[PDB]
Amino acid sequence: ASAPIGSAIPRNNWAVTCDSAQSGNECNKAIDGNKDTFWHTFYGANGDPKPPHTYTIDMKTTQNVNGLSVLPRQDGNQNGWIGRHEVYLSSDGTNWGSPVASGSWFADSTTKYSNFETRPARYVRLVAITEANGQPWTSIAEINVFQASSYTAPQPGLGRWGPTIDLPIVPAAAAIEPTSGRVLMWSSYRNDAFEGSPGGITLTSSWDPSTGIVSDRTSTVTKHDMFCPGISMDGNGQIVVTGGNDAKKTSLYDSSSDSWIPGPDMQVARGYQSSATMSDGRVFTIGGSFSGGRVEKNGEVYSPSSKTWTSLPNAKVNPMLTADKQGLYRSDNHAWLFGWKKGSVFQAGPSTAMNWYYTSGSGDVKSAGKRQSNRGVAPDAMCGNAVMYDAVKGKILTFGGSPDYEDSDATTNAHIITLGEPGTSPNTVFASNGLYFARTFHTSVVLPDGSTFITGGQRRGIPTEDSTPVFTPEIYVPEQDTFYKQNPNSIVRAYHSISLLLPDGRVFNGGGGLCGDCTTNHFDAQIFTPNYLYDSNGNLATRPKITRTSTQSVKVGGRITISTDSSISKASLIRYGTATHTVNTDQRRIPLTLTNNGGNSYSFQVPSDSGVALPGYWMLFVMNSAGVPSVASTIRVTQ
């Protein structure tokens, strides 16, 4: 099930208007409080006019609206289910502005929700853009609108949340498809559940940021229920999805052809493992005792060119195990892995002990010291996050998490780890004074300017529960070694939530739940727009444009020249991201040294070390002097 975030508004004095209604299926049947009566658009004798269909509510007074719900017809007939839709709010009934929510609802008879940031309104409008199976009609048995207790205007300068993207699944895993710019998401064998799986199938969904279109589709060709997997973009530009509910399977997502391709089975069955792309484009993985048995799961490495997995039994998992109260089931999960120089992988946590993993021969592991500061040795930080915000200088920011996977208090601990050569112990210091809010199950992304956006989670980790939620995101700014609270959102994003940086420089944050009959499934995502996209008046700033690039594919050490439409001061490459269960081993940022060729032409070198400039797809952002980024240009980095 799902739930509104507000409380139902009394409908006693509402005035409703529909684009059409069949006699006996009047517009006002959708607010009469009877599950067996419903509004329905014209059919039969009145013709069958196709969508868009529209339902407008005049609530007579201003309400602090934060959602609506739609109960489909309950007579076993599927006609009129709403598929693609938009929600608009107005204080006057004539200026509707842009949708507060839009997307697509799953094709079934369950109650559907649109939850969004509180906005004072008198008029609510639901537009059914398509019917869930493509037929011409729209029908609703009960429509409700919800309100928050209060309304606080967002503070200037702290970013903005919205719109909500309504989805047909709970997006517990997600990736950007770099060649198309679409967000690819998946849940499990069905839209909202993972238990009882038959295996061999995953429900996927995509959102196109340019068209707003949400679609869904099953994937069965790779015979893989991809819930609870490792995720890495390899050096061949394919997304490697490993294990989970089908613990030995490997599935490959190819952005260029928008298709899934079977991969070779892993040597060891795993779930909840992390995987990381290496400097040679191969993929390393270790741990993962959620599925496949609770035995010691040492490292193994995937080669995209030979299409094989090879066991690395001397890359031992034992040194990175946490002290989790639930034992091995949890203690080898969600490692903080970063591909680094000469085929090495750095393991930053969640265990106190940090390690170097090596992939030559049959593998190796060397202690890299403890994660610590002058404040002391950091405890285990399961479901903390780790983000490499400056790969050139080896800078990783880590934060949050809790000693145990579940039923454990989150920490405000945050650290800066500075990587040098593999096999040396990195310097670690505390980041500022820690997080404002202790959180676990939170998610994070590095932004074009090098700051890290941190969002969601809960103060005490209880999977399936939306208790002790943290609604205020934070941004870490490294040049000031300072955290800044941003404007809060209204939807809990704890266990099974994700965040990704979009090519347009906004943050896509979604998911949470995926627990079947629970009421805490979030079939949605929200956009966060950082302050760097706004001018001093709170309007969207004019953005610099990249008008030409000299190449779209470059070797490490290679040079690129671009043309812009205006002067630019700064530029960065951000590797495209993949996300599930707090893990994102694919994102990282390289600050670029620009040289000016005159005539708004600028050049830069991609770092020659492929341990820094990990092969795969990258976003090129340029920033003007006001700090406004372009949208990203896509660059493939090869080695």
Annotated binding site: 272, 495-496, 581
Give the whole-angstrom CA distance, residue 19 versus residue 34: 22
Give the whole-angstrom CA distance, residue 199 versus residue 190: 11
Q: Does an H or E element contain 386, and which?
A: strand 385-390
Q: How would you list the strands of the sheet with 308-312, edge to edge?
A: 274-277, 283-286, 299-303, 308-312
How many separate helices (H) and strands (E) can be counted in the chain?
1, 49
Bridge-based pairing of strands 101-104 and 160-166 is: parallel
- Residue 542 · residue 628 · CB < 8 Å: yes
Residue type at position 148? A
| 273: Cα separation from own chain's centroid | 18
Q: How would you list the strands of the sheet with 250-254, edge to edge?
A: 230-233, 238-242, 250-254, 259-262
Check 43, 113, 302, 495 and give the catalytic one: 495
Give the whole-angstrom CA distance, residue 219 versus residue 200: 9
370 DSSP β-pair partners? 353
Range list of β-strands (E), 135-197: 139-140, 142-147, 160-166, 173-176, 183-186
After which residues does the chain break, using C–N > 2.5 Å? none
The SS3 assignment for 574 reads strand
Give the whole-angstrom CA distance, residue 323 versus residue 288: 15
The SS3 assignment for 328 reads helix
The SS3 assignment for 15 reads strand
Q: Does an H or E element contain 251, and which?
A: strand 250-254
In 3-state terms, the chain is what percent helix, strand and coil (to 5)? 5, 40, 55
Q: Which residues are annotated as a binding site for Cu cation?
A: 272, 495-496, 581
Bridge-based pairing of strands 353-358 and 443-446 is: unpaired
- Residue 54 · residue 139 · CB < 8 Å: no
Give the whole-angstrom CA distance, residue 192 versus residue 174: 15
- Residue 498 · residue 579 · CB < 8 Å: yes
Cα distances from 303 to residues 60, 235, 527, in angstroms, run 64, 9, 36
The question of whether 495 is a catalytic residue gets the answer yes
DSSP-assigned states of every residue in 41-106: ---GGG--PPSPEEEEEEEEEEEEEEEEEEE---SS--TT-B-EEEEEEESSSS---S-SEEEE--
Give the whole-angstrom CA distance, residue 86 versus residue 482: 39
Give the whole-angstrom CA distance, residue 487 versus residue 509: 14
Give the whole-angstrom CA distance, residue 610 versus residue 639: 7
Give the whole-angstrom CA distance, residue 164 versus residue 311: 43
| 494: Cα separation from own chain's centroid | 12
Give the catalytic positions in this structure. 495
